[PDB]
Design a protein around this motif. Sequence first.
Motif, mmCIF file in Angstrom:
data_model
loop_
_atom_site.group_PDB
_atom_site.id
_atom_site.type_symbol
_atom_site.label_atom_id
_atom_site.label_comp_id
_atom_site.label_asym_id
_atom_site.label_seq_id
_atom_site.Cartn_x
_atom_site.Cartn_y
_atom_site.Cartn_z
ATOM 1 N N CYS A 46 0.820 -1.221 0.000
ATOM 2 C CA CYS A 46 0.000 0.000 0.000
ATOM 3 C C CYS A 46 0.854 1.272 0.000
ATOM 4 C CB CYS A 46 -0.940 0.017 1.196
ATOM 5 S SG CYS A 46 -2.073 -1.394 1.246
ATOM 6 N N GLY A 47 2.169 1.115 -0.189
ATOM 7 C CA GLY A 47 3.102 2.213 -0.297
ATOM 8 C C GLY A 47 3.175 3.094 0.953
ATOM 9 N N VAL A 48 2.907 2.512 2.118
ATOM 10 C CA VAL A 48 2.930 3.262 3.404
ATOM 11 C C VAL A 48 4.392 3.407 3.867
ATOM 12 C CG1 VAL A 48 2.351 2.923 5.880
ATOM 13 C CG2 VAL A 48 0.554 2.839 4.125
ATOM 14 N N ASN A 49 4.778 4.623 4.291
ATOM 15 C CA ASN A 49 6.136 4.852 4.731
ATOM 16 C C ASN A 49 6.187 5.376 6.174
ATOM 17 O OD1 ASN A 49 5.684 7.628 4.612
ATOM 18 N ND2 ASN A 49 6.914 7.963 2.785
ATOM 19 N N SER A 50 5.015 5.506 6.832
ATOM 20 C CA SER A 50 4.855 6.232 8.093
ATOM 21 C C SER A 50 3.710 5.605 8.900
ATOM 22 C CB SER A 50 4.631 7.717 7.862
ATOM 23 O OG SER A 50 5.715 8.331 7.175
ATOM 24 N N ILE A 51 3.899 5.532 10.233
ATOM 25 C CA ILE A 51 2.937 4.964 11.188
ATOM 26 C C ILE A 51 2.616 6.007 12.273
ATOM 27 C CG2 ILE A 51 2.591 3.124 12.883
ATOM 28 C CD1 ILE A 51 2.416 2.136 9.969
ATOM 29 N N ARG A 52 1.334 6.120 12.633
ATOM 30 C CA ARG A 52 0.850 7.037 13.680
ATOM 31 C C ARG A 52 0.249 6.183 14.780
ATOM 32 N NH1 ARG A 52 -4.357 9.737 14.363
ATOM 33 N NH2 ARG A 52 -4.251 12.002 14.768
ATOM 34 N N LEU A 53 0.545 6.544 16.037
ATOM 35 C CA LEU A 53 0.099 5.802 17.195
ATOM 36 C C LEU A 53 -0.455 6.776 18.234
ATOM 37 C CD1 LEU A 53 3.336 3.639 17.402
ATOM 38 C CD2 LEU A 53 1.123 2.873 16.442
ATOM 39 N N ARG A 54 -1.657 6.492 18.741
ATOM 40 C CA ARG A 54 -2.234 7.276 19.811
ATOM 41 C C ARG A 54 -1.655 6.789 21.154
ATOM 42 N NH1 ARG A 54 -6.355 4.603 17.309
ATOM 43 N NH2 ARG A 54 -7.048 2.703 18.403
ATOM 44 N N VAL A 55 -1.560 7.733 22.098
ATOM 45 C CA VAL A 55 -1.149 7.460 23.480
ATOM 46 C C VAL A 55 -2.266 7.880 24.438
ATOM 47 C CG1 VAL A 55 0.709 7.666 25.199
ATOM 48 C CG2 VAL A 55 1.193 8.153 22.788
ATOM 49 N N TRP A 56 -2.706 6.941 25.266
ATOM 50 C CA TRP A 56 -3.528 7.185 26.445
ATOM 51 C C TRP A 56 -2.685 6.997 27.716
ATOM 52 C CZ3 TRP A 56 -8.376 3.869 24.759
ATOM 53 C CH2 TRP A 56 -8.949 4.460 23.631
#
Length: 314
Positions: A46-56
């Motif tokens: 899917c050509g993804v180069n970046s990951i985002r993660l939420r913090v609680w």
Amino acid sequence: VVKEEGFARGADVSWLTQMEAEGLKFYTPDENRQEMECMDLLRDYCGVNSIRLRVWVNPKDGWNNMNDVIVKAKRAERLGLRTMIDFHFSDTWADPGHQEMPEAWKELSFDDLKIALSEHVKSVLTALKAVGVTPEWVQVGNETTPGMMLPVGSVDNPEQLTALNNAGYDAVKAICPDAKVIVHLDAGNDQWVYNRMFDILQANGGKYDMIGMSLYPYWAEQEGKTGGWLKVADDCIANIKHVKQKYNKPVMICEIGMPYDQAEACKQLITKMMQADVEGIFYWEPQAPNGYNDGYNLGCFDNNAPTIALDAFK
């Protein structure tokens, strides 16, 4: 594998560890339909180069706590994916209708709240550093359209909001001097939302490096709004130009999403938005099956595999 520079083609996959525990599998979208780990799948298919993660901060089920974020961040890092850490400053979902500070913070003086917020951000980034992850971007808050940690950080308390924000900014810079700090609102189509928040920060010495937006425009089609989802996207494009000119800050689309069965429209949405004056685009929880959690339907997978939506990224 090595990290890419330039445009961020992103996915938020915060749910992934919970999904894995629940026994969800994901598959290649090709003639083989081969079982695959989700981040690897997003990177290679899917050509993804970046990951985002939420913090609680103190979440009930542990998910999105520091420990969970570390596991997912290390996985992204291993796969040569750049990371965005998104501090909600809550024990649960932070959105425009719910900006509730952590239960454990509610009795704190304002000075002690700022210290608690600062210490949490430093705790999480320091751990990341320790395990070999330096995030490229960090959100101080998540869709803080009305402010954060209401009512203490309400826009109606602009000095307090700005001081909490700045406590966040300073904390990020303390551990990760090069991380771009993002103030992220919803409704990227609505200039007024952005004017309100960013004029507040301007008037109070509020610190930030980047303007973050959510863009979920399908409601305009469903509700029969003149111009449809396309007008919402064009209004967002105009807003992007507007905030760049007024504030001279770069823009990130921190969340994007359409219904999982609007694969073609969603592809066109992303292709369209990828020419706007933004530094990247993050699809929110692409891998989530239709119906996930409360009935969530804005993934971009079907039969446990990517639709054509993220062909825009390939």
